[PDB]
Short mmCIF file of C-alpha atoms and ligand atoms in Angstrom, two decimals:
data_model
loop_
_atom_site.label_atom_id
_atom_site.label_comp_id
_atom_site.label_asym_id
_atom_site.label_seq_id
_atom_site.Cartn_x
_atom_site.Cartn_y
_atom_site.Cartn_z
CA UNK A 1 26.32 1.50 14.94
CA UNK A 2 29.49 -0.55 14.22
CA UNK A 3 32.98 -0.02 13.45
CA UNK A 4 34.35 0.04 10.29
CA UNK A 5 37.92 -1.23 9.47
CA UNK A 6 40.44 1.56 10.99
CA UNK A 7 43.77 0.85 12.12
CA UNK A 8 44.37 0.81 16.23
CA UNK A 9 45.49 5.20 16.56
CA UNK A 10 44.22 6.25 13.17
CA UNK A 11 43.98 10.16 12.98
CA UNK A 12 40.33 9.30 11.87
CA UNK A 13 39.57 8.59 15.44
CA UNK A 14 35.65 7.82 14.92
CA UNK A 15 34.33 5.03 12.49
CA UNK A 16 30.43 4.31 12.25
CA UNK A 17 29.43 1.61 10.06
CA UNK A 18 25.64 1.43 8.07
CA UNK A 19 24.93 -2.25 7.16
CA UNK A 20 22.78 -2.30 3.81
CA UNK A 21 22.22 -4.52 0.74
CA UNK A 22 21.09 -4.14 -2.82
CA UNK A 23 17.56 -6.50 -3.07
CA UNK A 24 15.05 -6.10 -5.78
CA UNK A 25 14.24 -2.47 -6.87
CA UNK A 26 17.11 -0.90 -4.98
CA UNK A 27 20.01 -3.07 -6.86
CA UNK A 28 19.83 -0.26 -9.25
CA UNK A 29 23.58 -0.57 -10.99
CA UNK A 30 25.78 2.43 -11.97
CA UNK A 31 25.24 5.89 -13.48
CA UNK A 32 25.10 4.36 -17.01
CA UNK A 33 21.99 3.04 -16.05
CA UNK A 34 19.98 5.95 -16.18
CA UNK A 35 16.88 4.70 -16.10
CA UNK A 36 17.62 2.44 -12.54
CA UNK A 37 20.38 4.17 -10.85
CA UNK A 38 18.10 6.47 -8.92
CA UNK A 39 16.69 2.96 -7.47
CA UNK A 40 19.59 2.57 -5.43
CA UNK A 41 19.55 3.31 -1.24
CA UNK A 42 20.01 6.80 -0.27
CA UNK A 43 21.86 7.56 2.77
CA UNK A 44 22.05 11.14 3.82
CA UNK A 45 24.52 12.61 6.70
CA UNK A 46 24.93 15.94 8.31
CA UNK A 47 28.69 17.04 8.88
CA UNK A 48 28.21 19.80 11.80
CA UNK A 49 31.74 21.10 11.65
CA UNK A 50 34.02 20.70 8.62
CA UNK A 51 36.93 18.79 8.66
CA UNK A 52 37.91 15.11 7.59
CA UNK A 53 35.49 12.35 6.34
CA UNK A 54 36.84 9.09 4.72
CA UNK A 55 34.04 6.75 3.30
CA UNK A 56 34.71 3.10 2.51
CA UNK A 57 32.27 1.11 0.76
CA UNK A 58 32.55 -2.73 0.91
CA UNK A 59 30.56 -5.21 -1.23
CA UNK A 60 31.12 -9.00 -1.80
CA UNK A 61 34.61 -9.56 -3.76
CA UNK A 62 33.01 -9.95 -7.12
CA UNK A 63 31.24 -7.13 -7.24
CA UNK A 64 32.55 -4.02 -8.26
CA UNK A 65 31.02 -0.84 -6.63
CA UNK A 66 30.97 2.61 -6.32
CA UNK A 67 29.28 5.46 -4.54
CA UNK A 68 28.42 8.86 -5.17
CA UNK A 69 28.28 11.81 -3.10
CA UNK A 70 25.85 14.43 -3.60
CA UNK A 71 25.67 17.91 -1.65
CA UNK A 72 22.36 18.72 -0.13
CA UNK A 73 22.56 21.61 1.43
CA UNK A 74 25.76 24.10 3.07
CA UNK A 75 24.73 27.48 4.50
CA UNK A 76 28.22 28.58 4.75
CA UNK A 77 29.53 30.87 2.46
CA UNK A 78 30.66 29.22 -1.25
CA UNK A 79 34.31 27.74 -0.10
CA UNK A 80 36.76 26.24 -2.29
CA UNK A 81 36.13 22.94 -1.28
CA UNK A 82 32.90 23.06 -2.12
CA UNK A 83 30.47 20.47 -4.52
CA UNK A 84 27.75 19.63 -6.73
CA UNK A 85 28.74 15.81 -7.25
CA UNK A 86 31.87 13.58 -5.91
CA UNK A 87 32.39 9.93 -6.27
CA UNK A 88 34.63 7.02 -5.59
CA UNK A 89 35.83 7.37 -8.84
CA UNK A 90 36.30 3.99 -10.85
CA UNK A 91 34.39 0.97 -9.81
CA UNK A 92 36.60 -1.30 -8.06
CA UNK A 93 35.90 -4.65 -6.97
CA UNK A 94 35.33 -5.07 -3.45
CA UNK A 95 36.44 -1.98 -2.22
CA UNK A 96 36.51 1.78 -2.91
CA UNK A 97 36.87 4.84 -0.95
CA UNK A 98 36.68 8.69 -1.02
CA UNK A 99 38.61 10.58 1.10
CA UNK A 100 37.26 14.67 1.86
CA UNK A 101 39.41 16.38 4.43
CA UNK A 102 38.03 19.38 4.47
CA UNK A 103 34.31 18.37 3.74
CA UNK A 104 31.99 21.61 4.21
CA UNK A 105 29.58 21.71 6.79
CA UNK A 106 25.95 20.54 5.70
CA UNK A 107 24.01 17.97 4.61
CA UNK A 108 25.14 15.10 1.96
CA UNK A 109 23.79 12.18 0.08
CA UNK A 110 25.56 9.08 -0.18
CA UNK A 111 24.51 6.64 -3.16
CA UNK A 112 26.40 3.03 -3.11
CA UNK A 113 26.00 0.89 -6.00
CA UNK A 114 27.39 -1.62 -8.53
CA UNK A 115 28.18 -1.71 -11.50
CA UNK A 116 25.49 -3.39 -13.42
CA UNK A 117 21.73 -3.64 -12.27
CA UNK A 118 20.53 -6.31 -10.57
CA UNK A 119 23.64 -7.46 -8.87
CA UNK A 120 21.93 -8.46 -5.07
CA UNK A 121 24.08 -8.67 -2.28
CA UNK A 122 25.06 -6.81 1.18
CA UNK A 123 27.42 -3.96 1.73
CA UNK A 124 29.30 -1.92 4.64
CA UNK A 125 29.19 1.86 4.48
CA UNK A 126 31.83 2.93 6.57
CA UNK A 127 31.88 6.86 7.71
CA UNK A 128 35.31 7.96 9.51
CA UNK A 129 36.05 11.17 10.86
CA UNK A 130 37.25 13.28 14.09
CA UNK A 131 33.89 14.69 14.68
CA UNK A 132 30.31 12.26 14.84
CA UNK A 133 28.25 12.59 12.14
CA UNK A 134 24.11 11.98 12.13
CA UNK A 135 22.98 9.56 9.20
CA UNK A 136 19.52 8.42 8.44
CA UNK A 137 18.28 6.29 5.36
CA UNK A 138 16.40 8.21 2.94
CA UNK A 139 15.71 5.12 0.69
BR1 BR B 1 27.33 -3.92 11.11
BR1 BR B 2 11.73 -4.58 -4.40
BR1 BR B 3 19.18 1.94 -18.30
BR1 BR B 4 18.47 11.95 -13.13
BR1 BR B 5 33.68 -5.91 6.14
BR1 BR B 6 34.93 13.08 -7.55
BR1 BR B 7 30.69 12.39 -9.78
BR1 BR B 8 37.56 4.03 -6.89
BR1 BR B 9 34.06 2.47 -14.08
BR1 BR B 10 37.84 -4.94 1.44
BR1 BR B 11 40.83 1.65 -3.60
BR1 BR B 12 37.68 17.98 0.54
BR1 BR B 13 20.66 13.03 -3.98
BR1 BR B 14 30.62 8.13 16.44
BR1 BR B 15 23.57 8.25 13.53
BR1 BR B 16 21.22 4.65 8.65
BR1 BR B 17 14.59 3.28 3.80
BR1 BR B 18 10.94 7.20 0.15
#
């Protein structure tokens, strides 16, 4: 893997990047598309000791995108800063972000899309954190 875009002495102090796009079935648009959204890629990552992740997402400028994250699985105990469902929040164009500094140890889903279906086009997922994180594409 890459880099993503971290400034020289960042306290995030490790930054992989996953290259993806959205093409054909997987351009799968945002939540409000219920019957496509599920379409989308799938990325899933294990955090092995909790602590601070910061996910950027990066699509062409007139897009606007989002991403969701989804807990699979934590065997701790049922912390505070435990989940069901986060997400970037409101699309943005271009850019968004999600910042989780004290992320639970376990296994996650990542799902980056745009706003509307069929919008094709390449992104940058980029994962940052003090400790490396595994990440394989589910879909
Ligand atoms: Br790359
Ligand atoms: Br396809
Ligand atoms: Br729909
Ligand atoms: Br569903
Ligand atoms: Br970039
Ligand atoms: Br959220
Ligand atoms: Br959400
Ligand atoms: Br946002
Ligand atoms: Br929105
Ligand atoms: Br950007
Ligand atoms: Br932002
Ligand atoms: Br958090
Ligand atoms: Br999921
Ligand atoms: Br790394
Ligand atoms: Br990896
Ligand atoms: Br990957
Ligand atoms: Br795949
Ligand atoms: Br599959």
């Amino acid at each position: 893997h890459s880099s993503g875009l971290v400034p020289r002495g960042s306290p995030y102090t490790l930054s992989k990047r996953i290259n993806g796009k959205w093409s054909g079935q997987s351009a799968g648009g945002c939540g409000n598309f219920q019957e496509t959204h599920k379409n989308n890629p799938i990325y899933q990552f294990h955090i092995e000791k909790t602590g601070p992740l910061l996910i950027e997402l990066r699509g062409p400028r007139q897009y606007s995108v989002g991403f969701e994250v989804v807990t699979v699985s934590t065997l701790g105990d049922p912390g505070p800063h435990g989940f069901l469902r986060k997400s970037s929040g409101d699309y943005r164009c271009g850019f968004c972000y999600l910042e989780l500094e004290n992320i639970p140890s376990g296994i996650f889903n990542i799902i980056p899309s745009t706003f509307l279906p069929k919008q094709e086009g390449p992104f940058f997922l980029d994962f940052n954190s003090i400790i490396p994180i595994k990440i394989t594409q589910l879909q």
